Design a binder for this molecule. Sequence first.
Ligand SMILES: NC(=O)C1=CN([C@@H]2O[C@H](COP(=O)(O)OP(=O)(O)OC[C@H]3O[C@@H](n4cnc5c(N)ncnc54)[C@H](OP(=O)(O)O)[C@@H]3O)[C@@H](O)[C@H]2O)C=CC1
Ligand code: SF4
Ligand SMILES: [Zn+2]
Lengths: 114, 206, 154, 146, 292, 95, 134, 48
Amino acid sequence: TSVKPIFSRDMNEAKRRVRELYRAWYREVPNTVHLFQLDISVKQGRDKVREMFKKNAHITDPRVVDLLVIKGKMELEETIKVWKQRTHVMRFFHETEAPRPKDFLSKFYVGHDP
Amino acid sequence: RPTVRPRNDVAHKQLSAFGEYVAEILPKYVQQVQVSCFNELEICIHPDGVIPVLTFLRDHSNAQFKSLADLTAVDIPTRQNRFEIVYNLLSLRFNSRIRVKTYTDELTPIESSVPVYKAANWYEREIWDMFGVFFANHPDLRRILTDYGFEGHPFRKDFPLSGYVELRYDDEVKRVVAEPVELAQEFRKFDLNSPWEAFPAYRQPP
Amino acid sequence: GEYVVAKLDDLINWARRSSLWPMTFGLACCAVEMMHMAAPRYDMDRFGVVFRASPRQSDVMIVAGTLTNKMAPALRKVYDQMPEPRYVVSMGSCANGGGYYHYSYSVVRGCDRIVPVDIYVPGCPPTAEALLYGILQLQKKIKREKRLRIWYRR
Amino acid sequence: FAYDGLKRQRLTEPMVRNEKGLLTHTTWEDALSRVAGMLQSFQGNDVAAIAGGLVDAEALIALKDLLNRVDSDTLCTEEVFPTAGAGTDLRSNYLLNTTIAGVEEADVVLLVGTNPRFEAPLFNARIRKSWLHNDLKVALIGSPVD
Amino acid sequence: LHHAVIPHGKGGRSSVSGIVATVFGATGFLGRYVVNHLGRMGSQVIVPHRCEPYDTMHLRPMGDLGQIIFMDWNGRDKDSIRRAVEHSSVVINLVGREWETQNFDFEDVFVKIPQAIAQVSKEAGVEKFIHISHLNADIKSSSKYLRSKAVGEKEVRETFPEATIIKPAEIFGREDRFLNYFANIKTVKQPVYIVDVTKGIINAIKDPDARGKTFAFVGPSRYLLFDLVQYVFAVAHRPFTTRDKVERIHTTDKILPHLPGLEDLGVEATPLELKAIEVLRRHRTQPAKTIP
Amino acid sequence: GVRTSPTGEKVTHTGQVYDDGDYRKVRFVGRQKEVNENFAIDLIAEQPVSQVGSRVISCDGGGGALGHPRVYINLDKETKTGTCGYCGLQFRQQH
Amino acid sequence: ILPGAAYTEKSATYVNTEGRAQQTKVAVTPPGLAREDWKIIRALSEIAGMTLPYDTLDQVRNRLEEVSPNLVRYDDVEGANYFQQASELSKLVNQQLLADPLVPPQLTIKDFYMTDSISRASQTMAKCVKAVTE
Amino acid sequence: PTVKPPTARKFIWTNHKFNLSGTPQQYVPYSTTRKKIQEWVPPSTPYK
Ligand SMILES: NC(=O)C1=CN([C@@H]2O[C@H](COP(=O)(O)OP(=O)(O)OC[C@H]3O[C@@H](n4cnc5c(N)ncnc54)[C@H](OP(=O)(O)O)[C@@H]3O)[C@@H](O)[C@H]2O)C=CC1
Ligand code: SF4
Ligand SMILES: [Zn+2]
């Protein structure tokens, strides 16, 4: 079960990198909302950031966590340096996607998909 | 024989001899050496050997492979290490080419070869972007070809041809938006392979 | 009175179609053939179509090549900065409907998903003459415009 | 060759009877509400179901579970099988226990009250294979079909 | 359902919603949002237009190939109305002008034209009819705009009894003549967001219980006109028109409790405070007090 | 062999026509339905049967290399004619 | 009338005459508004306030396993025993044999082609029946 | 063509047409195939 590490040698070190990334994202949201002239609140921007972290809470592989942080840092670099445009930043919010039905009956009415 | 490509035995022997030469000098890393019937020399190495093997081929006086022609990856999902990393090098001094191949999986970094060849910089970014292979100690590893915020690595065999999202302008929000991809005409998959074996010379033992 | 309005439409229509200043997005292959339309054999300038115009003095955007997802936002921004009246000519299969990269993950399947399009020039690429035919077809479209006639009847 | 029947006479929409007693298209919401109302007002033997010849097992158990929740056990098939004795208590009462491949191992086959050629064409073909290659002895009680 | 109009897909651009809609007045403020939401889910949209085709160009990207169809029409020509509606399953009327012209007065846009659309739609067999009226429509209003809206609202209900009639308050949005109107410069107002009105219209098309009903689309908050105009100037970072238009702006927004509203179509009204900056950002070179 | 439907829409040579309740015919309002009037099925039927004096004839569709792959048609049955599978020309063995 | 799915339009379990469980796969989806059959009953149970305890194909097949475990052993032939016990019970009640001869429902090829809704709707099967009776 | 006239065919257009885009004679695409699935039609008479 011996593998080559990416950065972290265990989950404790991986979690430290996660918290540093979260802090960097949390502090950058107010600037992003201003520079990109977004129509969302800073609270919405930070709520979205927290949502994105939370969905990955179950990972226990430090290598997977390392890659998630690597990708998170690249995403933050694109935002901070304004490589993204307004459309790229707003793609986290799916503003034109009408909500898909979730309960069995609503999905049964509209189509065949599970 | 007008239609058959002629063989070149002189080049086949030279490359075979140099293949043994390389494998004798770097036994720590070389796993396999082979020469194709059209005379291309391939060195297969353990991924730890990337920097030492490339440095030897660039700097050694009987090698002098000063030019990195190309660096790419191939995705083979059936393998435990699905990604094959391919270095194609050119030696102007000896008017010869060589191919170096190693392997990695999704979670195992490969050492960046920018220290050996500055040409490797963008190639490794392209491999990261298209295949998701992470290169360690790269001066600036980030996407290069895909759109900003693009999720996934399109050149993987299990990434769909048309992707997952498509763009359009939306008037209500006055910007370009991304939405799940729907196609007016689905791409029509073709099953073209003949059920009769073509090349007996490559038949795999059963 | 309606006779006056008919002749002013003719005047302003004649001026606008006789002085079509294009902005070309030379996105890919098709840009080469628009260069050949400017070149001496066809000399688009002789029709009043200046070779290159800045986006803010432009009347027609020519989308000449493949529009990727990465480039689509930039193209929309340029269209939104064009002073009116403004027209869009889609040139080549890629811009018309995605063409040979229609099934790609990174390609917009026709620039009409991003901007409205007045003329579709088919071909991969359309010849310089085919593009010139499309430009002259846009001129005839402008000739049919009746903005003042319709204004007078509101 | 019967697949082309899948393109004819198909049921594509829910239908209910209207004021004139004619079947008319309606929504899934409306059609199921009509059934649910009648289902909620009946119990026990007042509710029954008959399963046809092409029904699958997932639908068979779903319908069984639904009528069981109104305390109905009248889950019927069109094809009869005698309930005398063990009935369907023991699988071996109603299975081809030798298996289709087991025909090739048999030496005598007694066919009773059946025409396998048309009832089970590929089963009958497996008999002829044994008849041809294993010198199988076949006897029939019933009509002298070919 | 005819086989051609059974829904298919996942509700996207290339899907088939099963809606075939004729939208009169599609080239205006409300029309561009309505057509967008119809084309988002893959509806067939027929756009009758009176204006130059150049002025309908912004609608073309709103639907997949073939889904937006344009036709000429004249408000006074019933044959041109029949051409536009005889293949549709729903007709939506968004025709109106905030001012009168030498050729069309308020009695034309708000009575004669809606009645002709309703009558021809009834004759052609159109199942559903959605007619936009006004919250403050009233035959005793000081506004000839609002008096006509009341007369026409009654004639549509008589001509096409199953029509869904929608009565919006002042609508605000990027292209509105409300927030923009103040920025370009006694009374309580309850303005409603454009996207809310659009969603209400779309959900009325689908809801069968909406047929024959009259809805009032209002925003979540009531404001004094002075407090609203003050807020607009603050948001526009600015130091703080016909006669009929002024009367409308000073008409207090009626409170019709008996009518169903946006919540009866599954639509949550959007507060002005969330969207005001979106509309007013381009005007740049403390939330308003609300009535309990 | 072009005919119109009760709606007046022309039926194509492939038998296509929108039925009465199909909304899709709105696409033709103010425009037209492209229909090719030269029905190949009727044009080929107008060609006369060729009388030949052998059991087997060959057809390449005319023009040699500009026609179709050359095929050989058996004319043993007198019940019907031999038809080329490519171009539809018909042949008959004489007496 | 509740429009269901044909065997080419669903992934569904069938058990052959040997007791061997096999499953189909979706080749095409059901036409129009037709739905997968077990989903119709599952949807009906919720509208009737008797929601069934399974929401996916995998879960309804977990249910099938609770009733008859062999029904999810795909391609396996599970042997059945206890012929002695069945034979003992079959003798407990004596029912006489009718004097009618044993006559199969299908005596000639003409009776073979149409035997179910799908084949009765087939134009090909109609041609076969016409061909062998004429 | 005054010196080498084209080969005559009965089906060749006798009247050439120019580009008709933007007119009421423009081409409008449509599916040329017939309906694939035939729906069941319920009986006209009542009987529940
Ligand atoms: N916006 C609001 O605040 C509210 C609006 N409403 C009603 O909603 C509807 C649309 O609102 P809005 O979209 O803002 O109105 P707009 O003025 O923005 O658009 C009006 C539409 O009506 C068409 N139209 C006007 N006069 C005629 C005519 N004589 N013949 C044919 N077409 C004509 C216009 O077409 P053209 O471009 O050709 O002029 C335009 O498409 C109107 O009925 C309006 O009264 C009700 C309550 C609030
Ligand atoms: S349409 Fe053809 S020539 Fe033009 S950019 Fe695309 S591939 Fe190149
Ligand atoms: Zn031939």
